[PDB]
Amino acid sequence: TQVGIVGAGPAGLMLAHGVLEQGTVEMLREEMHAIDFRFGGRSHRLDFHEASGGRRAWVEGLEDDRARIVCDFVAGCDGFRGVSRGSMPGIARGYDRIYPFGWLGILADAPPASPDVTWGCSDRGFAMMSMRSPTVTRLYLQCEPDEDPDAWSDDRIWSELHRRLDVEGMPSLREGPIRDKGVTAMRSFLSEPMQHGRLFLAGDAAHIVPPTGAKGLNSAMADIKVLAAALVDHYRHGRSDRLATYSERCLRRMWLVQRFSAALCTMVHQFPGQNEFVRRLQRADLDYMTGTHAGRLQFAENFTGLPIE
Amino acid sequence: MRTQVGIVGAGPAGLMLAHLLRREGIDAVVIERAAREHVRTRLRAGVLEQGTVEMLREAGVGGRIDAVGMEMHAIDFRFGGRSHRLDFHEASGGRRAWVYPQHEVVTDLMSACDAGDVPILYEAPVERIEGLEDDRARIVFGQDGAAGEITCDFVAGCDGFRGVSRGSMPAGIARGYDRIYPFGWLGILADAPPASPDVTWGCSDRGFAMMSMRSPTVTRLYLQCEPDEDPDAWSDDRIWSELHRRLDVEGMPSLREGPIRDKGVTAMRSFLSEPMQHGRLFLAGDAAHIVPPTGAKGLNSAMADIKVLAAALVDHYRHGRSDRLATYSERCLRRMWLVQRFSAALCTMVHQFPGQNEFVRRLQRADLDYMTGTHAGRLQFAENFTGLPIE
Ligand SMILES: Cc1cc2nc3c(=O)[nH]c(=O)nc-3n(C[C@H](O)[C@H](O)[C@H](O)COP(=O)(O)OP(=O)(O)OC[C@H]3O[C@@H](n4cnc5c(N)ncnc54)[C@H](O)[C@@H]3O)c2cc1C
Ligand SMILES: Cc1cc2nc3c(=O)[nH]c(=O)nc-3n(C[C@H](O)[C@H](O)[C@H](O)COP(=O)(O)OP(=O)(O)OC[C@H]3O[C@@H](n4cnc5c(N)ncnc54)[C@H](O)[C@@H]3O)c2cc1C
Ligand SMILES: [Ca+2]
Ligand SMILES: [Ca+2]
């Protein structure tokens, strides 16, 4: 064939054809207004819809004449554990930072106590309440990176979620039967370049982020929006400049996405043994982000999605 | 020997407070450990926030800043081989900063204090501060071996990072937050007229450097160096070599060299102590908090503390209300944690950290790109650099 797509993820199916950015929605087409950051015993509802001016969120032979997937071009869409990223010659460079924690996630048959996605930036550790339906809620707890889910009974999970999320004046967390308990990792990684000859990387094969900020899929999509158009210009108008600049343009937008994702991750989680000045700057960062127009503006523009080149 | 407010330290914070109190009729005595001639000739550059300039102007000591203070509109951030001129006057909607050296602020304030007969004791190091919950506080000092005591309603601890007032808090009350960064600054003056007029920051992966105007014919230059560094390990040739490497970009004039003088090394540290008051003791300025000099914030923060403290003391003596004294620390700390955030953000973005994680290192360029390249980034920089509001 012309284009050999490795991996059948959301990036692999978007080229052949959680929380989503407005750009990801319109790309699929072609509903969130605020996040409640809780800290210091108080709710801080950051209306990013208003601050953003109306944007919203929603819930072998790569140098030869032909490439061979054991086609003209190979689209690496095989995620963080695929083989496409290692399919390059000294060409690749890796930027890696793992965070000293994971997330314990549950799906509960209980109505959300509030309609906004809620971030509990507690000194016990991070917690998050997100919705799915008026009767189904999605919840996360910061936990040890290698945590055994068997150590967390249903009662332990609800107790800790209450401690990390409840504040006076807001409805308390509603409890219900628990489904889909699991532990997921927290890691920042990016690899350069994102192309080499006939091999083009996208999505998790190129770069992973911590889920704080909901960017891993939305960046995979923008990766595909760019790779798809370049292949269109190549096959339709005989124009190869877009393919040659694929890595350059994806990396520009992604390094700003890594920035935002990491900024949230390092702000809302507790780091064991951290320098006490750096630890107190987490609250200063939360106060500035929620409490000033400039802080709210930067959050709103980044959360709803950066432009795509 | 008896007064209303005893002020420990005749640096900018103490002199400003003595001056404000004098014009409100409130009696104060300033006690300073060094010699007047020493304090008067401590030369230090200075970038003043607009609020600081307004404060000096409204206290009758802004005449010379109004006459020769050099209005500053932009910083040139150099990285990735290019200049990025961030116009914070535009980004902030018209607020700005002024280049006006700290030693001339101190000259201005000392002249105002002397013209108002404010009593200042020099060569009189304070040894203890006691009676913080007595009817009147006691400042125990010595000139030579002569023991002295000043009795006062309130003690303003304006004696800097190395003073005695911070340690006079009951240690079960005070909490410190401290980070020493793993680098210092090698600083020089060069007898060469500045090639570019803007404050210029070299922020590339080769290491931090800074260039600014000391005077029309003298350039101030800083280089990131090792924290314990001997200035004698930096010959003139090594200095110019590193400065060219860290600052020069195509499309901007190359560095103008000239005689090097005033070579020295300074440390980089973020520190804040809580609370800023206990009983009759109120801390202000470097006695309470210091920042790394990226961002031009230490003197301006000391002046913000003094603005709040003087107004609280006026409310107490003039209007008989003590609630503003009661909230001094709460209000000053809220601002100062945001100043610490800003100074720290600049410091961790523009310096190379030895052995740093390569992902975290590359986010430095992402942060520079976002701060210079987006309206939202420029706005935040500009509002912080020109000065946050004061409560
Ligand atoms: C807990 C959690 C929450 C998240 N929340 C959000 C969110 O709210 N918003 C958001 O935008 N993102 C979110 N993400 C990130 C997002 O889910 C991922 O970034 C996304 O899966 C990336 O898509 P991808 O197709 O590139 O990778 P994947 O989805 O991992 O696709 C890789 C595919 O390739 C296949 N494959 C692997 N190796 C090979 C091989 N050798 N040959 C063939 N096939 C192979 C795999 O089996 C898999 O099907 C979250 C991630 C986690 C873990
Ligand atoms: C190189 C450099 C550049 C800077 N640039 C800027 C800038 O552009 N903008 C900015 O806002 N800030 C800047 N700063 C920070 C600023 O200089 C300080 O924050 C400022 O000096 C703080 O003033 P202060 O009155 O609190 O303390 P200090 O100036 O330290 O004065 C304290 C005084 O107390 C006296 N004292 C100490 N112990 C005793 C004792 N026991 N008894 C009596 N007296 C005592 C000392 O002798 C001294 O005179 C810079 C700092 C440096 C090092
Ligand atoms: Ca088990
Ligand atoms: Ca007594």
Side-chain angles (χ1 to χ4, degrees):
Chain A
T1 178
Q2 295 170 277
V3 170
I5 306 182
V6 178
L13 305 170
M14 190 41 175
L15 184 56
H17 176 50
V19 174
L20 299 189
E21 295 168 15
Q22 176 164 327
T24 302
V25 174
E26 297 163 339
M27 182 202 191
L28 297 172
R29 157 183 291 112
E30 191 280 326
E31 194 234 31
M32 297 163 54
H33 279 24
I35 292 176
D36 180 3
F37 300 91
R38 298 194 190 169
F39 55 87
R42 288 177 173 86
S43 157
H44 310 80
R45 189 179 179 268
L46 203 169
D47 185 344
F48 55 84
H49 178 66
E50 173 166 9
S52 183
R55 303 195 67 92
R56 318 117 176 278
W58 280 265
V59 173
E60 207 179 349
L62 315 170
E63 317 208 50
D64 297 351
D65 59 311
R66 68 272 193 184
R68 293 150 260 153
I69 297 177
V70 181
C71 46
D72 312 325
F73 307 100
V74 178
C77 313
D78 49 352
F80 188 56
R81 305 184 58 254
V83 295
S84 294
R85 180 169 68 261
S87 303
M88 291 183 178
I91 300 300
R93 167 164 181 174
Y95 300 91
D96 196 23
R97 190 246 174 116
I98 306 195
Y99 298 92
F101 43 78
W103 277 6
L104 185 72
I106 64 162
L107 195 63
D109 279 288
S114 290
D116 306 319
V117 175
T118 300
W119 288 26
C121 312
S122 158
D123 57 1
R124 302 178 65 86
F126 183 70
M128 186 187 297
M129 170 188 78
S130 101
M131 50 286 321
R132 297 275 305 265
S133 74
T135 58
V136 172
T137 176
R138 169 66 153 172
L139 300 124
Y140 293 105
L141 291 157
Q142 177 188 340
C143 64
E144 289 294 336
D146 50 340
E147 182 59 297
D148 184 355
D150 290 352
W152 289 79
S153 71
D154 286 11
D155 186 81
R156 187 186 180 187
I157 289 168
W158 289 116
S159 165
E160 196 54 30
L161 286 166
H162 279 295
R163 297 206 224 188
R164 292 185 192 182
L165 287 161
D166 286 349
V167 296
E168 306 283 353
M170 293 296 291
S172 293
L173 220 49
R174 172 84 183 262
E175 301 178 17
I178 285 178
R179 317 154 34 194
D180 302 25
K181 182 176 74 185
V183 176
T184 57
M186 297 291 282
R187 183 171 190 170
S188 285
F189 167 88
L190 192 146
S191 193
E192 302 184 331
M194 287 175 62
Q195 71 186 92
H196 177 89
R198 306 178 170 279
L199 173 65
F200 300 85
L201 303 182
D204 268 19
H207 51 58
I208 63 175
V209 290
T212 56
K215 298 276 155 284
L217 180 148
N218 297 262
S219 296
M221 282 302 102
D223 272 2
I224 291 304
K225 185 181 170 177
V226 176
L227 184 57
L231 293 173
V232 163
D233 283 76
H234 172 76
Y235 282 128
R236 138 152 290 266
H237 287 126
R239 213 182 291 175
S240 294
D241 57 323
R242 297 285 174 87
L243 273 173
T245 62
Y246 167 74
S247 185
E248 139 175 43
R249 286 173 291 142
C250 288
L251 291 171
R252 265 204 292 277
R253 190 202 180 262
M254 193 63 207
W255 268 118
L256 296 191
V257 158
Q258 293 276 352
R259 171 184 177 276
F260 181 64
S261 292
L264 302 177
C265 187
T266 55
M267 178 179 64
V268 306
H269 295 87
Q270 293 307 292
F271 287 73
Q274 180 173 58
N275 174 280
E276 293 295 316
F277 174 81
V278 177
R279 167 165 293 184
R280 182 51 181 83
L281 287 187
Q282 302 181 295
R283 172 61 179 270
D285 281 331
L286 287 158
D287 284 329
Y288 191 88
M289 178 189 289
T290 58
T292 67
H293 174 69
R296 291 187 299 261
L297 181 75
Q298 173 168 168
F299 177 83
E301 299 193 327
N302 273 275
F303 189 60
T304 60
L306 296 173
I308 301 167
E309 294 185 0
Chain B
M1 203 146 283
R2 288 188 77 262
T3 194
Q4 286 165 277
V5 182
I7 298 171
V8 184
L15 295 165
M16 182 66 176
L17 179 63
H19 175 69
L20 292 173
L21 295 180
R22 175 69 173 119
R23 296 163 68 88
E24 291 273 7
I26 297 164
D27 309 339
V29 175
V30 180
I31 314 101
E32 162 64 49
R33 67 168 302 280
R36 181 182 192 272
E37 205 42 48
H38 181 277
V39 182
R40 189 172 178 90
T41 53
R42 298 160 167 169
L43 304 195
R44 187 171 291 177
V47 176
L48 305 181
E49 294 167 7
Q50 178 164 324
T52 301
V53 170
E54 290 168 350
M55 180 188 186
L56 292 158
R57 187 186 298 149
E58 286 153 23
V61 286
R64 197 166 179 278
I65 306 170
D66 280 351
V68 297
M70 188 173 173
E71 214 170 278
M72 174 187 181
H73 295 163
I75 292 179
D76 177 10
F77 297 92
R78 294 187 186 182
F79 57 90
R82 296 182 173 276
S83 168
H84 313 76
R85 180 162 191 281
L86 203 171
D87 184 335
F88 55 77
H89 175 247
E90 178 167 6
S92 71
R95 297 188 67 85
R96 51 233 188 269
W98 279 253
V99 175
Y100 191 79
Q102 177 164 321
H103 63 270
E104 289 176 12
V105 172
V106 169
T107 294
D108 293 348
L109 289 173
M110 291 181 53
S111 167
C113 285
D114 290 351
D117 293 295
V118 169
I120 309 170
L121 306 188
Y122 292 97
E123 311 182 45
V126 172
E127 304 166 344
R128 326 189 310 268
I129 300 163
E130 49 186 50
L132 302 186
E133 289 170 303
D134 207 339
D135 304 325
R136 280 170 200 87
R138 305 180 285 278
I139 293 169
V140 180
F141 65 106
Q143 192 148 12
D144 60 70
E149 195 188 58
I150 282 151
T151 294
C152 49
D153 298 336
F154 303 101
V155 181
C158 298
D159 53 358
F161 187 56
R162 304 291 188 191
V164 309
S165 64
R166 177 169 71 258
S168 303
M169 201 122 311
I173 294 292
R175 181 175 174 177
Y177 302 79
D178 194 15
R179 180 187 184 176
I180 296 163
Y181 299 91
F183 40 79
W185 280 1
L186 179 79
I188 59 156
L189 295 175
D191 282 317
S196 302
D198 295 314
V199 173
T200 296
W201 285 17
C203 305
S204 79
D205 51 19
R206 180 77 196 166
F208 186 68
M210 178 178 313
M211 175 177 90
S212 69
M213 168 169 307
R214 165 70 182 88
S215 83
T217 63
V218 180
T219 306
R220 155 66 74 184
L221 294 144
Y222 292 107
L223 292 159
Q224 181 190 343
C225 61
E226 296 183 343
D228 57 315
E229 183 65 295
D230 187 349
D232 292 335
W234 288 80
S235 70
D236 288 1
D237 186 81
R238 188 192 183 182
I239 291 171
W240 287 117
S241 176
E242 264 323 294
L243 284 169
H244 285 291
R245 285 188 283 244
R246 294 178 194 192
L247 286 169
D248 283 352
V249 298
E250 297 281 345
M252 294 298 291
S254 283
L255 286 185
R256 169 83 187 261
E257 301 179 6
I260 287 176
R261 52 188 180 86
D262 262 45
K263 200 169 56 176
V265 172
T266 57
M268 299 288 277
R269 183 178 198 166
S270 297
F271 173 78
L272 182 155
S273 188
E274 303 187 336
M276 288 180 61
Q277 72 193 90
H278 173 80
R280 298 179 177 285
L281 178 63
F282 295 76
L283 302 183
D286 278 13
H289 46 66
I290 55 171
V291 290
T294 50
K297 294 280 146 280
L299 166 59
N300 290 295
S301 298
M303 298 298 95
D305 293 338
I306 290 308
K307 184 177 189 195
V308 177
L309 181 52
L313 290 160
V314 169
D315 246 63
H316 169 86
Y317 284 119
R318 184 172 293 285
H319 310 297
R321 302 176 169 272
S322 297
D323 56 305
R324 285 186 60 162
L325 287 168
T327 61
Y328 169 73
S329 175
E330 154 178 33
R331 287 179 291 147
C332 284
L333 284 173
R334 274 196 294 269
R335 192 179 186 269
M336 193 69 210
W337 272 112
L338 300 179
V339 173
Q340 289 289 350
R341 169 190 179 275
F342 179 62
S343 294
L346 296 174
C347 188
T348 58
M349 175 182 67
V350 305
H351 293 91
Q352 294 309 290
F353 284 75
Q356 184 171 63
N357 179 274
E358 301 301 318
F359 174 82
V360 174
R361 179 170 295 236
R362 177 57 179 79
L363 282 186
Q364 298 182 300
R365 170 80 124 111
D367 282 329
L368 287 165
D369 286 333
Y370 191 89
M371 173 186 294
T372 61
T374 65
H375 170 261
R378 290 189 296 266
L379 176 64
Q380 176 174 160
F381 174 82
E383 297 192 336
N384 276 274
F385 186 74
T386 58
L388 293 176
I390 304 163
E391 292 187 56

